[PDB]
């Protein structure tokens, strides 16, 4: 399993421009945790074969995923929007 601080910083470098309300990787990870722990209305969910849970809110266009123990994998805004969600 990838080292978590590096996973968080790498995802913040890649996706931070999608979340200009946040200024650092810690705020980004906090926001991902908060999103999947207290999903806003309209957040849809799916489970993957390894126990990961996927989250997608079409209103904000926010996708995120976490493993079976709640460790975030990623959070981003897919350019394809709901079409991305309906592909899995």
């Amino acid at each position: 399993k990838v080292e978590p601080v590096g996973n968080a910083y790498g995802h913040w470098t890649k996706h931070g421009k999608e979340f200009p309300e946040y200024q650092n990787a810690k705020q980004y990870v906090d926001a991902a945790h908060n999103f999947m722990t207290n999903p806003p209305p309209g957040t849809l969910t799916k489970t993957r074969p390894n126990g990961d849970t996927l989250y997608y809110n079409p209103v904000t266009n926010v996708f995120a995923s976490k493993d079976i123990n709640g460790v975030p994998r990623t959070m981003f805004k897919p350019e394809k929007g709901i079409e991305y969600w309906n592909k899995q």
């Binding site: 990838v2 994998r73 394809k80």
Partner: protein, 58 residues
């Protein structure tokens, strides 16, 4: 660290299809985009095929 990155093919991925970011080529290991290599606009802006084409020039 022992699965191939779907873009560059080097063994950098720990858990396949779990959105790890390859340290060599920058590809985020999105399973929708490896299952459909022409699908742009998931975790990565380019499709997998676009990212492989670009990387093979690099």
């Amino acid at each position: 660290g022992s699965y191939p990155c779907p873009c560059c093919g080097n063994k950098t991925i720990d858990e396949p299809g779990c959105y790890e970011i390859c340290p060599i080529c920058g590809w985020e290991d999105d399973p929708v985009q490896s299952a459909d290599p022409d699908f742009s606009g998931g975790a990565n802006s380019p499709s997998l095929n676009e990212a492989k084409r670009a990387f093979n020039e690099q």
